[PDB]
């Protein structure tokens, strides 16, 4: 005697796509319900599986010039400390050049880890100068203009001799926060005391005025790459982070 009774639980025929356990199909179109092996044939064996792949590749976030006209202690550039940052842009074709790190984290509600600001100098073996990079712990909105180069030394920072055989200084901003993770508030209409996206701001001071002869540029440009190590993101969401017009 057939006796296999099962009660119909709640959420009858309800659909959920928040995860794969419920998003996965319940049947297949494939004949005999077959499957597929792996195939790196024309893929050079470069099989991707993690977003880390992008969040670890230093991409160009911003460029700032260091003119000889800049005097000692003068703030050259200020940048918030959150992966969602990038200001690079090209006129035509019209496009807001987002960074790898950014384009990834932009799809998450939270993040944490050590952001890495790589600074590349484009001088000539004839210039000479130093720039102090200072990270002021806090939130993406803290008036910082009122900070002497001296005052800046209190916070963690690093100076760099531009004129040299080397060309890049790597600034690893340690995860410093009152919260375990920061949120992608760049989606919200306004800002709220507490709901922050960055753990502070980065500053580029003029340690030593840029010196040079006369048959060389009157300044030196600097590319600022951005990437992250020990990064962690969670809570999927959609949003194309716009440009942070500094």
């Amino acid at each position: 005697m057939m006796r296999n009774e099962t009660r119909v639980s709640t959420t009858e025929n309800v659909v959920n796509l928040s995860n794969y356990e419920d998003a996965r199909a319940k049947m297949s179109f494939a004949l005999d319900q077959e499957d597929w092996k792996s195939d790196p044939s024309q893929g050079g064996g470069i099989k991707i599986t993690h977003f880390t792949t992008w969040t670890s590749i230093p991409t160009l976030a911003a460029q700032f010039p260091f003119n000889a006209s800049d005097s000692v202690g003068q703030q050259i550039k200020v940048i918030p400390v959150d992966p969602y940052f990038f200001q690079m842009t090209n006129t035509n074709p019209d496009q807001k050049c987002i960074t790898a790190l950014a384009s990834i984290c932009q799809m998450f509600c939270f993040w944490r880890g050590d952001l890495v600001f790589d600074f590349q100098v484009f001088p000539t073996k004839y210039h000479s100068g130093r720039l102090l990079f200072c990270f002021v712990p806090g939130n993406e909105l803290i008036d910082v203009t009122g900070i002497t180069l001296k005052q800046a030394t209190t916070a963690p920072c690093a100076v760099m001799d531009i004129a040299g055989v080397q060309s890049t200084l790597r600034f690893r901003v340690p995860w410093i926060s009152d919260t375990p993770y920061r949120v992608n508030r760049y989606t919200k209409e306004a800002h709220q005391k507490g709901e922050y996206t960055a753990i502070g701001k980065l500053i580029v001071y003029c340690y030593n005025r840029l010196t040079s002869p006369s048959n060389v540029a009157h300044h030196v440009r600097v590319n600022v790459y951005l990437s992250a190590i020990n990064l962690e993101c969670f809570a999927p969401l959609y949003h194309a982070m716009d440009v942070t017009t500094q």
């Binding site: 998003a23 996965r24 179109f29 494939a30 993690h50 055989v165 993101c233």
Partner: protein, 225 residues
Amino acid sequence: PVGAITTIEDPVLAKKVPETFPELKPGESRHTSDHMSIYKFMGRSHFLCTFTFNSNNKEYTFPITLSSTSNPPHGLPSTLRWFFNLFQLYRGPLDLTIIITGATDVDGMAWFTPVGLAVDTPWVEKESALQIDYKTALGAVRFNTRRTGNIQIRLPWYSYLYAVSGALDGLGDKTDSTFGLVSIQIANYNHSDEYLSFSCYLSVTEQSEFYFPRAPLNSNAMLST
């Protein structure tokens, strides 16, 4: 601190683990799974497209194209768009899930049509022009709004190519940029009834692969319906 200074122009030196100030081990996360594992992430079937039937005994055929060119609604929107441009080559089945909205007691059918074969004109609602025989043959599925209201079936890796891609130009961007096509044909839909809407979402499978990382689409490219 040695990794605080290096020559990025040199491919080797650039891989030197960066380190500026003294830090301690971050520790352990409080949530089980890693939300950055593509498989687990896209595992969350994201939005693809949506359409609405107007007359009875008609059909809609939307293609699954990675083409960064094809702007939505007639193309990849939101997340799906963004994702399928982070890499150059894609291949593998895809767990599609379509939600039905509105009408009721409407009998329906749907079949997956591989790239390079006969199929009703894309992104257009019209009276099907295919032999019921032909339709079914490609493997189809029947259903009724009343009894269900949603369908989750897997889409096969049936293509004469090794892989497909979104970032392409004119020509190739018209052949090697498609997974395949889906076609939904309704039946018994006296418009004297409510409207009939369909929502399609795609989720990546474990049998899906991703090759070679590209530079993500610039914000201006990321569109949404």
